[PDB]
Design a binder for this molecule. Sequence first.
Ligand SMILES: COc1cccc(C(=O)N2CCCC2)c1
Ligand SMILES: [Mn+2]
Ligand SMILES: [Mn+2]
Lengths: 137, 137
Amino acid sequence: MLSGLNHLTLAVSQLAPSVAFYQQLLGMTLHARWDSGAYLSCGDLWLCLSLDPQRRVTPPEESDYTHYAFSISEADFASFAARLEAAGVAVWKLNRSEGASHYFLDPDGHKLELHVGSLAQRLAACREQPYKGMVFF
Amino acid sequence: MLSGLNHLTLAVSQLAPSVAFYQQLLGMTLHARWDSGAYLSCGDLWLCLSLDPQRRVTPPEESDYTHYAFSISEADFASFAARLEAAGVAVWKLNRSEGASHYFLDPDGHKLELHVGSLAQRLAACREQPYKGMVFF
Ligand SMILES: COc1cccc(C(=O)N2CCCC2)c1
Ligand SMILES: [Mn+2]
Ligand SMILES: [Mn+2]
């Protein structure tokens, strides 16, 4: 039986700017680095950056909707978004759903998100206003 | 600050087979589906499957090393991996370069992994068998 997400691994084209982005800009804790990768944590999340020459710096119009959302409190959301904006981090989508969300790109074009709110909160909102064809289990 | 992974969203080309893969084959909990997506949980992980006409079924030699690992206990690991193998689930990696792991593909070629062990355990193992150039902070 699977008990949760063990780790998220992102392929990166250049290790140093990716470490700077996740550790310094996004505030994650750097635990180890080697010639071809790094391990960071963000709360319970174990993040691995893996140096991969096959990683392309990918414009957001050229990748699908797969994305990684990090939790932040409502109280901290606006100042963190402003930090990303000051750093010139590109946005790939505007928020149109429930709960605050900021959609931003990493140096290689990985699609990231800041989101406020849990699955339970989303399901409660959906019960009141179900999406087209929505069924609950 | 950021406190962990709020959710993982995977773009999928065909919703029903992807829901079946994560719910029936991997045992995740299905909470809701709709015409264009589904919400599942795996322990504390919120997984969203999002129907995306841009998603392509991607062979593993065409994608980079970005991947998603799910936690499983030492007692359950081998029989779960063997069940996926017997079910014909495609693979993408054989060499255990990061501990006890089984590497497999979802229907769209998303790179998945079963892994036994925490970040702390991986750091302790790496102190004895470090990756080239490894430094610990
Ligand atoms: C909305 O929940 C479900 C569950 C199982 C299947 C489906 C679905 O796509 N169908 C069922 C009738 C034909 C199309 C939806
Ligand atoms: Mn999202
Ligand atoms: Mn892994």
